[PDB]
Amino acid sequence: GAMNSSNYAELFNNDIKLFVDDTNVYRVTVHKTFEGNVATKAINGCIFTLNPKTGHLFLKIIHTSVWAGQKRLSQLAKWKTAEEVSALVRSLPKEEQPKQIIVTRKAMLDPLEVHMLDFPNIAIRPTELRLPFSAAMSIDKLSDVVMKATEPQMVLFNIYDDWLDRISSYTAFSRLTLLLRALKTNEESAKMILLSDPTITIKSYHLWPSFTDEQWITIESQMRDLILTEYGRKYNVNISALTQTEIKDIIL
């Protein structure tokens, strides 16, 4: 069924599963025309398909040519997502195919179910989790590959860098979701936190900086403070007066 605030640890068992997020597939700018009407212009997008146990990210770049001459693009984008995920599954060896695919948006359920009819044993599920995978385009190296693409392309990343050498997949997923939620909430402040210190760098083969264990604790605290600070600004709430239980609930 749905994947809620009861089945958290299922994400880190040994059954292969993928999250699919389609938020960034169809992306547009909106502008006035010479005659004073409004028009959209599509920009390159991506499908975010992530194995939460291993960190493997299958980033399918959606080039704007796929929309040329097509109608009802927001509907088509869901079916294109489902077509690409189905093609990905078919391209993987049998022992690498997922047993479950979890979609971040319920509107992806029917398109994916229909494209996966030939895989009756792969469960297609929604989730009650509010995962911030839309903020993937705030990761500089991911945004760069998407915007530079001149044709459809699949790019493979490990979104956890080398963290699984030191932490569990449960903790790595928690760290990723905290980082992405902070980037979604205040992108400039989050990037300042991640890059403020010149002495810590991002390896050529990584997405995130090379923090030590203790530095990651500090970074994570600063990200929680960012989220709490923005919550206070949004709702006109004095965050200093809040208790630890109130703060933990808001971050959750």
Partner: protein, 300 residues
Amino acid sequence: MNTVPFTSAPIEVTIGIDQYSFNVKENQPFHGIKDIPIGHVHVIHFQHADNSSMRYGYWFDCRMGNFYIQYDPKDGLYKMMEERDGAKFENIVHNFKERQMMVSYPKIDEDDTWYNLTEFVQMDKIRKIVRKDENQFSYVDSSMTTVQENELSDPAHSLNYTVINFKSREAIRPGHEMEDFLDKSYYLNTVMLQGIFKNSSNYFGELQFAFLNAMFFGNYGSSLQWHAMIELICSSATVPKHMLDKLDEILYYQIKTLPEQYSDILLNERVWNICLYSSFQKNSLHNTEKIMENKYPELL
């Protein structure tokens, strides 16, 4: 005109014949139904006064044999049987008619209701949905499941309606996933009409039989099939223009006949609102839309 005699009526029962219903008292001198119009299928149905559980009944056509009803005290129900001795049957019927012990089928002259509900229903197709080859008539009851229900359990006692499933490989061509899911025309025209039913009359006959089993028996599987066959047409962009016209007539008479107090259980809100207001054919069912809006505006 033809006749279905009853040996006797040992238990109090509501007997329905087509869209009509009447009550027989325990051990009343009731001996059957006369003046049944030749040229249509008919259904004789029962609901026991002391146990409204199990509506049950029999579809039959008097052109196919001489049929009568006899109560079985072991199985506890009124059973249809065929009499092969024609002179005996005529003698029985004549005596009961002479003594005025049979109620009269009251087909009022202006009234085309039964024809309008059964235009496409044939006994030979009923006997393929309800499989019991040794009888010329077909038993249906409230609780019989459909083949499709039995997949999601005695096969010999099931309704073999054609399985309709919008998220099945039958309904969706590889490579045409979006097209075929959003526009059911392939599934309607190529798979169902050309492939399974062969023509729109057979499709309409099964749709009409499903509706009548839902209404007369309170059969859930029948109600699901009726709605699925409507939704398949309404969700197709390309349908033979006369077919939509004939469907509008079929549905109009079904909605007109439906008992108002059963509208909550026999009509699916989701399906009807989609068909009348969202589907490709939302503007193609003007007569059905008008009766639905005037008789059951709450459902919409």
